[PDB]
Amino acid sequence: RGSHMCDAFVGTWKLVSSENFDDYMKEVGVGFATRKVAGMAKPNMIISVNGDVITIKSESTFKNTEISFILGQEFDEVTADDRKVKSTITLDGGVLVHVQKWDGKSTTIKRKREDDKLVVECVMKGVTSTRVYERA
Ligand SMILES: Cc1n[nH]c(C)c1-c1c(-c2cccc(OC(C)C)c2)n(CCC(=O)O)c2ccc(C3CC3)cc12
């Protein structure tokens, strides 16, 4: 019950830049209207740890959601775009790797600290979106 290295992710984060998000979304299969409304949002992301359980929440004009999970242990997740997926989050040397699977597809969201930023890379097949957060 002392420090985690994940206690580098802990806190409150605000989105400060987005690249290629619409394309990432299209590749995922997100509908037009949802893409438009989601891409406008400037969420905060709140990350906390309590023993082995990591919680990530979004505070967003698009959708307020939360996930709680244990590294390496699969869980059910209903995404903001209303996909029902099976997810697993692991820590691969400093990077939090979030894999979502549904209908024989998958997408990977990687989150890592760089300088004072938390960089989120969303990947679907060959399309990558980079979403950059700073401390709130
Ligand atoms: C849950 C939510 N509310 N408002 C936004 C924006 C989102 C959203 C998040 C997000 C942002 C902050 C925290 C967060 O936490 C959850 C893991 C609880 C998710 N991600 C993850 C990648 C990112 O940080 O933008 C998304 C990836 C794709 C999509 C589009 C609909 C398909 C939306 C999001």
Curated annotation (Swiss-Prot):
Subcellular location: Cytoplasm; Nucleus
Cited InterPro entries: Calycin, Fatty_acid-bd, ILBP, Lipocln_cytosolic_FA-bd_dom
Modification type N-acetylcysteine: residues: 6
Organism this protein belongs to: Homo sapiens (Human)
Gene designation: FABP4
Protein name in the entry: Fatty acid-binding protein, adipocyte
Cellular component annotations (GO), alphabetically ordered: cytoplasm; cytosol; extracellular exosome; lipid droplet; nucleus
Subunit note: Monomer. Homodimer. Interacts with PPARG.
Key words, A-Z: Acetylation, Cytoplasm, Lipid-binding, Nucleus, Phosphoprotein, Transport
GO molecular function terms listed in the Swiss-Prot or TrEMBL record: fatty acid binding; hormone receptor binding; long-chain fatty acid binding; long-chain fatty acid transmembrane transporter activity
Main location: cytoplasm
Modified-residue entries (Phosphoserine), positions: 17
Domain writeup: Forms a beta-barrel structure that accommodates hydrophobic ligands in its interior.
Gene Ontology biological process terms, A to Z: brown fat cell differentiation; cellular response to lithium ion; cellular response to tumor necrosis factor; cholesterol homeostasis; fatty acid transport; long-chain fatty acid transport; negative regulation of DNA-templated transcription; positive regulation of cold-induced thermogenesis
Residue numbers bearing the Phosphotyrosine modification: 24
Motif window: Nuclear localization signal: 26-36
Coiled-coil blocks: none
Pfam families linked to this entry: Lipocalin
